[PDB]
Scaffold this active site. Sequence first.
Site, PDB file in Angstrom:
ATOM      1  N   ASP A 181       5.047  -4.451 -15.576  1.00  0.00           N
ATOM      2  CA  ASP A 181       5.362  -4.823 -14.193  1.00  0.00           C
ATOM      3  C   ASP A 181       6.761  -4.348 -13.782  1.00  0.00           C
ATOM      4  O   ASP A 181       6.964  -3.947 -12.628  1.00  0.00           O
ATOM      5  CB  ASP A 181       5.309  -6.355 -14.003  1.00  0.00           C
ATOM      6  CG  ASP A 181       3.940  -6.896 -13.566  1.00  0.00           C
ATOM      7  OD1 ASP A 181       2.918  -6.196 -13.565  1.00  0.00           O
ATOM      8  OD2 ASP A 181       3.898  -8.116 -13.214  1.00  0.00           O
ATOM      9  N   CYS A 215      -0.897   5.601  -7.864  1.00  0.00           N
ATOM     10  CA  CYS A 215      -0.346   4.328  -8.305  1.00  0.00           C
ATOM     11  C   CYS A 215      -0.276   3.472  -7.041  1.00  0.00           C
ATOM     12  O   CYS A 215      -1.246   3.465  -6.270  1.00  0.00           O
ATOM     13  CB  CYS A 215       0.978   4.546  -9.041  1.00  0.00           C
ATOM     14  SG  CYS A 215       2.210   5.672  -8.229  1.00  0.00           S
ATOM     15  N   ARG A 221       5.036   6.476 -10.876  1.00  0.00           N
ATOM     16  CA  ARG A 221       4.170   6.711 -12.041  1.00  0.00           C
ATOM     17  C   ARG A 221       3.318   7.972 -11.863  1.00  0.00           C
ATOM     18  O   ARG A 221       3.128   8.752 -12.819  1.00  0.00           O
ATOM     19  CB  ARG A 221       3.257   5.497 -12.297  1.00  0.00           C
ATOM     20  CG  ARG A 221       4.014   4.214 -12.628  1.00  0.00           C
ATOM     21  CD  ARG A 221       3.087   3.003 -12.695  1.00  0.00           C
ATOM     22  NE  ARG A 221       3.848   1.778 -12.545  1.00  0.00           N
ATOM     23  CZ  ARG A 221       3.309   0.566 -12.484  1.00  0.00           C
ATOM     24  NH1 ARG A 221       1.995   0.419 -12.558  1.00  0.00           N
ATOM     25  NH2 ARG A 221       4.090  -0.501 -12.327  1.00  0.00           N
ATOM     26  N   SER A 222       2.803   8.199 -10.643  1.00  0.00           N
ATOM     27  CA  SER A 222       1.981   9.395 -10.388  1.00  0.00           C
ATOM     28  C   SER A 222       2.777  10.673 -10.611  1.00  0.00           C
ATOM     29  O   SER A 222       2.250  11.667 -11.141  1.00  0.00           O
ATOM     30  CB  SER A 222       1.434   9.366  -8.964  1.00  0.00           C
ATOM     31  OG  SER A 222       0.444   8.344  -8.760  1.00  0.00           O
ATOM     32  N   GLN A 262      10.816   7.842  -9.075  1.00  0.00           N
ATOM     33  CA  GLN A 262      11.466   6.875  -8.179  1.00  0.00           C
ATOM     34  C   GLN A 262      12.761   6.273  -8.717  1.00  0.00           C
ATOM     35  O   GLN A 262      13.500   5.639  -7.937  1.00  0.00           O
ATOM     36  CB  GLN A 262      10.514   5.711  -7.896  1.00  0.00           C
ATOM     37  CG  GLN A 262       9.426   6.013  -6.924  1.00  0.00           C
ATOM     38  CD  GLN A 262       8.488   4.815  -6.744  1.00  0.00           C
ATOM     39  OE1 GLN A 262       7.748   4.425  -7.662  1.00  0.00           O
ATOM     40  NE2 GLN A 262       8.542   4.213  -5.577  1.00  0.00           N
TER      41      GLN A 262
END
EC number: 3.1.3.48
Length: 282
Positions: A181, A215, A221-222, A262
């Site tokens: 998370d 994502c 994450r992508s 990110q």
Amino acid sequence: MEMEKEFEQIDKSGSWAAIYQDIRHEASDFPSRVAKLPKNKNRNRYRDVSPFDHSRIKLHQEDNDYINASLIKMEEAQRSYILTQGPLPNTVGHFWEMVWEQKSRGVVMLNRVMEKGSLKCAQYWPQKEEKEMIFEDTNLKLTLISEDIKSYYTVRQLELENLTTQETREILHFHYTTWPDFGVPESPASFLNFLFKVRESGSLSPEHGPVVVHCSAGIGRSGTFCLADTCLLLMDKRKDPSSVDIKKVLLEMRKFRMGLIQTADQLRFSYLAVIEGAKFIM
Ligand SMILES: COc1ccc(C2=NCCc3sccc32)cc1
């Protein structure tokens, strides 16, 4: 510089934030005028994440052709990816329309439906064989065929039917279920194992349309997934694998979608994944 020793040099000097901010400063800025039209407000999950006009995927519809999705075309590596946001309640039919129209074999999902106690994307595929889904706005039917649950990821076989023509296709759903998370994984080993499972299925190969990867926003994450895949492919293709420059590859990818990677922690994790992955390849 090479990668593994550039890596240790940034760790020892603690300069990951400065490296990452340089990337943000040098990244391309292209217009995203279609994304910001008022009629498309409820088609975007986040107001600050939009596809560029020049690389956006168009739906084959004359009313409204807009979806928050981008084509990342890597010329030297000979690989293409579609990166998109997690589907919204009012865009699940658009999502499967795109999968159909672009002739994709595989969908790669890197988030859970709920994280941090909030919804990160719609429940957009069926959970039981006998309870199929119909998307009336785009005239598609989606059925769960089989499901294989493993410790770090799940693979599903799905049948997508175009109800207008009665044509059917088999779609593979690759769901990485264990990204934490907060932060990034401590080791890249399970993420790399997952990437290799997607590769082995054919879903990334030229005989199919581009893989669809998402994502929640379709950039963090992508971005890690396609950056690691492309860097490893270039290390296999070139005479000198130490010439592959992960910062240059990331800036090339950011010509096609804003914001890829990110955080500085996601940047460090991408280096770690490519470094460990290059040893296993040989
Ligand atoms: C009018 O139809 C709509 C259906 C769903 C939404 C959204 N629900 C979840 C969160 C967010 S962000 C952007 C759209 C949404 C918006 C409009």
